[PDB]
Design an enzyme around this catalytic site. Structure first.
Site, PDB file in Angstrom:
ATOM      1  N   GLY A   1      -8.509  -2.643  10.657  1.00 49.50           N
ATOM      2  CA  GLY A   1      -7.723  -3.784  10.239  1.00 49.50           C
ATOM      3  C   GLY A   1      -6.823  -3.540   9.025  1.00 49.50           C
ATOM      4  O   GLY A   1      -5.926  -4.345   8.756  1.00 49.50           O
ATOM      5  N   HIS A   2      -7.063  -2.450   8.301  1.00 52.27           N
ATOM      6  CA  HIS A   2      -6.283  -2.144   7.116  1.00 52.27           C
ATOM      7  C   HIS A   2      -5.737  -0.678   7.075  1.00 52.27           C
ATOM      8  O   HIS A   2      -6.293   0.140   6.318  1.00 52.27           O
ATOM      9  CB  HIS A   2      -7.183  -2.398   5.929  1.00 52.27           C
ATOM     10  CG  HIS A   2      -6.459  -2.472   4.633  1.00 52.27           C
ATOM     11  ND1 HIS A   2      -5.532  -1.526   4.241  1.00 52.27           N
ATOM     12  CD2 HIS A   2      -6.542  -3.363   3.622  1.00 52.27           C
ATOM     13  CE1 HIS A   2      -5.059  -1.847   3.051  1.00 52.27           C
ATOM     14  NE2 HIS A   2      -5.659  -2.953   2.649  1.00 52.27           N
ATOM     15  N   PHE A   3      -4.693  -0.318   7.842  1.00 55.37           N
ATOM     16  CA  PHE A   3      -3.956  -1.175   8.786  1.00 55.37           C
ATOM     17  C   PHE A   3      -3.758  -0.470  10.099  1.00 55.37           C
ATOM     18  O   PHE A   3      -3.574   0.729  10.099  1.00 55.37           O
ATOM     19  CB  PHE A   3      -2.536  -1.422   8.306  1.00 55.37           C
ATOM     20  CG  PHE A   3      -2.459  -1.830   6.885  1.00 55.37           C
ATOM     21  CD1 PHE A   3      -2.800  -3.116   6.509  1.00 55.37           C
ATOM     22  CD2 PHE A   3      -2.046  -0.935   5.926  1.00 55.37           C
ATOM     23  CE1 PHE A   3      -2.722  -3.502   5.194  1.00 55.37           C
ATOM     24  CE2 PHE A   3      -1.975  -1.306   4.609  1.00 55.37           C
ATOM     25  CZ  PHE A   3      -2.316  -2.589   4.239  1.00 55.37           C
TER      26      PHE A   3
END
Lengths: 135, 130, 146, 143, 137, 139
Positions: A49-51
Site C-alpha cells: 500500500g505504500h506504494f
C-alpha cells in the site's frame, strides 16, 4: 550484549504486524545507549500500500522502530509513546536496506524518559528523532 | 464539501494497508483547512500486534492519518512525502469504536489535530515535500 | 451497560478477522434489546476484494455483525433465556433485506431484539442503520450449541 | 465444455481475495437455469484464525456468500437471455452441519424467478453429497 | 551490476507474499553467476505460523528464494521450477539474518535449464541445492 | 475411521500454524506398512495465490513439497519435532490451481538415527503432480 527477536519478545508486548525490530546488536547500561537492527524486505505487508508502483518505507514506521528501540533500553534499566519532537527524513528507505538504529537517553524527569535516535542505511542518515516515552 | 474514499484514491496513491482515511467531510481553499474522518475498528490488522491483550491504536498511525489529511488539502491547493514532523502530542488511547476526526490547517507546513468525541487525542506540526 | 471490545472477547470466542463488533452502546435484559456499533474503514482486508474498483461492505458481513450482537444479547440473558434448561452458533437467517451500500467511513449502528425462545433455539430481529437510515434488517436464529 | 476455472470466474465477477469464494464451476445450463460450483475449504484461509481460534469452522455467512456468488455467475451466464448482480435478499437460510477444513463444498443453485432487474434462486451447499446449508437468494442487477 | 526490487518486478511476475528477493547485488552472463539478497525480518507473515514460539525461516522458502535468483539469471540470459535435488539445510535462519543467495547456471540442455545454488548468512553456507527450471509459458 | 485425524488433531502433533499449516487432515495411516495418506485442499482464498501469480494462480511447487514434508513428519511422529534435513529427487510435474484436491501419500523407506527417509508423492484426481524423497531429522 546481543538480543535476538525472542529475547525482544520477553521485553516488549509488540507482535506482528507491529514488532518492528529484529535484534539488538549492542546495549549500554552505562552510556544509556542502544543499537538495533530492523531488516527491510519487500515481503512486509505495508509495502503493498505504500506504494503500489513504488515500495518505500513509511517514515512513521522507522520512527516506530526507533521508538521500539528506545522502549527496550528503558526496560533494561511497559513504556508507551508520549511524544516525538524534531523528526527529519533525508533518504528513501527501500527493500534491501538493512536498517541500523541508535538511540540514547538524555532526560529522566519523573516516570518519563526522552531519547535521541538516528537511523542509518550503509552508515548514511535516513532519519533522526527526539522521542518521548513513559511508564 | 465532501470527498469519499474513491476520491481520496484519485488524489493520493496510498493503498491498503496504508490508506488511513475513510473520507473528507469539509475542506476550504480560502481558509486553508480540511476535516477528514478515520473510523477505527477491531478489524484492522495492526491491533493484533498492538497489543494482544490490549488493542490501542499506535501513536504513529494517528500521525500518518494526520499526514494524509494534510497532503490532500495540499493537493487541493493546485505527490507529497513526509519531510518533517514536529510537536507531536499523544494524549489518550484510541481504541476500537472511536471515530477519528482530523483537522488540518496549513500555515509546505501545517497544524493538525486529531479528535475523538470532541476530545483531542493528538496534535502535531507537519513539514512536507514533493 | 457499555461493553468495549475487551469485554466482547470475554463473551464471544470470535477473533480477527471475524470480530465484527467494536462495542456495545447499550443493552437491556428486561427489554431483550441491544445496541452495538461496528466502525467501517478502508483499512479492513475484505474491502480489497469486494470490490477492488469500489469498496463496499458485503451484505453478509453486516448480517454477521447482527449475529454477533444477537449472541452477546444471547449470553447476557442466558439465565433469563434458559431458565427451563455454550456459544450461540448461527442456525438460520431469514428476512434479510439490504437497502443501502455501506461504505468506508460509515458507522454501523446495530439493533437486535430477541423475540422468540424455543428449547435452545433463539430468534432475534435485527436492523442496522447508517446515519439513522436503514441499511439492512434480518431475522436471526441462533442455537446454544457445542 | 461446461467448466469454468478460477480465471474464467474472474472475468465473470469482480470479486477478488479475500471475497472470492469459488474455485471453479463444474457444470451450468442456461437451459435448465442451474449451476454447480465448487469451493475447497482449507485451514490456510485467514478467516479460520478468528472463527474460531480453538475450533476452525467455516462461518455460515461465508457459505451463503459462496452460494450467492454461484448465483451471480448463473445470472451472468443467463444475462443475454433475461434482458453487476448484487445481493439484495437472503431468505430461508438453514445451516445444517458444520463445515471444516478438508471439506469440498459443492454448491448448486437454480434460478426460480425473473422479475425486472431482480432475480431469485434456490441454492444448496453440500459436503460428500449431504446438505450443509440451503437458502433462497435475491440478487438485483445494478450499475 | 545492481538491480533494485523495482527492476526485479519487471523481470519476474512473483509478487507479495511470494516475492522472495530484495535485490540483485551482481551478476555476470559470461561466468553465468548471480548474487542476491533477501532480508529476513520478524515482520513477515510466515514467521507467525513457523513457528509460533520460534520464528525460523522455512527451508522451502530459502529454496524458493534460490529458485527466484536463478530464474532472473535465466532471463538475464516465466521460468517454472521443474526439479529440486540435493537440497541441504545447514543452520537455521532467523529474524535479523541477511540472506545472500548465489546461483550459478550449470546446464542448459534445450528448454530445460539447471543451476547450483547456495544461501549464506554472515558468509557461512545455510542451505544449498541443485535446481531445474523449465521455460514453460 | 479409527484412522482419521482432523485439523485439530494435526495441531497436537505438529507446531506449524497459519500460514504454514498445509494439511487439512490425515485420511489413513499404517504404523505397520509405514504409510500415511493426507489431504490438502487448494483454494483461491489462499494468500500465496495473490503473488503466484497475480494473473495466473498456481501453487508454488515448494509449497507442495512443504505439504509432503508435514505429512512425512506426522508419520514419523506416529511411528516414534522432525525438521527438514534434506530434500532430494523433486519432480514437479503438473501445475496445481484452485479447485484441486491434493492427496498426499508418504512412505517411510529407511532410517539412520533421528534422520529419517521417506518417499512421497502428491496426487490430483489420481494423477501424480509432484514426487520427492525427504530426509527429516530429530524424532
Amino acid at each position: 550484549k546481543q538480543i535476538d527477536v525472542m529475547g525482544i519478545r520477553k521485553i516488549l508486548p509488540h507482535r506482528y504486524p507491529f514488532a518492528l525490530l529484529d535484534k539488538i546488536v549492542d546495549w549500554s547500561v552505562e552510556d544509556r545507549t542502544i543499537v538495533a537492527q530492523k531488516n527491510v524486505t519487500i515481503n512486509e505487508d505495508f509495502f503493498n500500500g505504500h506504494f503500489p508502483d513504488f515500495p518505500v518505507m513509511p517514515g512513521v514506521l522507522i520512527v516506530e522502530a526507533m521508538a521500539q528501540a528506545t522502549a527496550i533500553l528503558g526496560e533494561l534499566m511497559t513504556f508507551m509513546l508520549a511524544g516525538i519532537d524534531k523528526v527529519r527524513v533525508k533518504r528513501p528507505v527501500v527493500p534491501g536496506d538493512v536498517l541500523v538504529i541508535e538511540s540514547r537517553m538524555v532526560k529522566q524527569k519523573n516516570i518519563i524518559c526522552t531519547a535521541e535516535s538516528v537511523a542509518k542505511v550503509d552508515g548514511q542518515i535516513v532519519c533522526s528523532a527526539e522521542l518521548m516515552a513513559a511508564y
